[PDB]
């Protein structure tokens, strides 16, 4: 209840941590630990009736975010773990079910079968990109194919539970919490050309409500970097 980091404070009341391991620290990489370790609340998305899903590429949603974004232009390298708090707040008269899954190395697929998607289309900075429940056509050149039953990666979307995940059932549950360690092949990588995590929120059972209730429900994502450090002097 009412946890705080730096100059921010959020409140909480069930956590699922990564692949079982907890994030920790390692020329010489220096340790900045107090200046940017805080809760970065992104803006809320609206869960409507015929909504399809959302995604965020994770070391890119915190690129225009304050002093964390200032520490990226000053540093060529870095390695960072995360802690993600997702909560949506509806009444007891709404009903639905969300899957909050955190995918490492999620290559997206382009709509044209020869090309590859562009950086403006793969990831909106600190802004959610949307799945669709129709097909993106082949005629446009560089756009992400977002048929949500394939999850944009050419796979069964029901089998996405092999990644570290959490269900949000409005009947019983209210929030989700993930703690994701640093997963990469190299120990310290180029932070400008690599988005090594992807946070997806997909409504399996759609939102429903009776006439009179509030016709859409907000979802609030909060990311807090754990064990961030960069390389330089």
């Amino acid at each position, epitope marked *: 209840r009412s946890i705080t980091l730096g100059n921010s404070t959020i409140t909480t009341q069930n956590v699922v941590v990564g692949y079982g391991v907890w994030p920790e620290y390692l020329d010489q990489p220096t340790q900045p630990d107090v200046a940017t370790c805080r809760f970065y609340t992104l803006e809320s998305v609206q869960w*409507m009736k*015929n909504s399809a899903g959302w995604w965020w590429k994770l070391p890119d949603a915190l690129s225009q975010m304050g002093l964390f974004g200032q520490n990226m232009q000053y540093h060529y390298l870095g390695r960072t773990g995360y802690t993600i708090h997702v909560q949506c707040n509806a009444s007891k008269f709404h009903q639905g079910c969300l899957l909050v899954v955190c995918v490492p190395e999620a290559e997206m697929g382009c709509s044209n079968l020869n090309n590859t998607p562009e950086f403006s289309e793969l990831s909106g900075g600190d802004s959610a990109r949307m799945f669709t429940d129709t097909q993106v056509g082949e005629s446009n050149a560089k756009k992400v194919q977002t048929a949500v039953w394939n999850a944009g990666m050419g796979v069964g979307v029901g089998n996405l539970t092999i990644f570290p995940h959490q269900w949000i059932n409005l009947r019983t549950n209210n929030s989700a919490t993930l703690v994701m360690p640093y997963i990469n092949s190299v120990p310290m990588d180029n932070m400008f050309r690599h988005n090594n995590l992807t946070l997806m929120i997909i409504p399996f059972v759609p939102l429903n409500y009776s006439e009179g209730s509030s016709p859409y429900v907000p979802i609030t994502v909060t990311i807090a970097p754990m064990c961030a450090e960069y390389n330089g002097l």
Partner: antibody
Amino acid sequence: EVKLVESGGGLVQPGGSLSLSCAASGFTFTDYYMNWVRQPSGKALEWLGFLRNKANGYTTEYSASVKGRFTISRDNSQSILYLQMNALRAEDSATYYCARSRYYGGTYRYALDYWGQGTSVTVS
Amino acid sequence: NVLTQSPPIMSASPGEKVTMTCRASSSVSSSYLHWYQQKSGASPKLWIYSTSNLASGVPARFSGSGSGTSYSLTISSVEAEDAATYYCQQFSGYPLTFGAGTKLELK
């Protein structure tokens, strides 16, 4: 009841521009897909494009024949659907309809349930 | 993916059963094939959606069928007020292609 009227057709020199407009009343505008279909004089129908609802982000999906020339949009104030036609040719002389789609289960079958009365566009 | 309708011109007296077919070039799914009806000097109307389901306000004389790459539409008893043109729509990829048109004139 559902009522889709539209307006804006007329005469145009080939190589010019024209803007159609579809006025929608009788339903919530931000919840359905809205299409654009043309038909020439006594020929088959031809689908030009649609525009998804608010929950899918108002993205557009043009046909391969008119991609780059035409533009579908909407007005954010009132429930008016637009069609900016640019670079008109000799074979664009047709009757332009305005259609709507809905979800039948929870799925989106690609049918068009309600149609507009049709405005006519011809070139000279 | 183009659709061919046959026959183009169809004539039949009222009271009998007549049917038309719409054969696709490739495989179209059973849920993405629809039938429309356009009278002379009027806009089309959705008639049958997803190859077997009657729309709203349509009389029960019609029943669509077919699967794979061959689809059909049957009229159990032909009246006088349902003489129009009938188109079939599909979706395998974009765009949404229509049929050629089947014109029904009463005899």
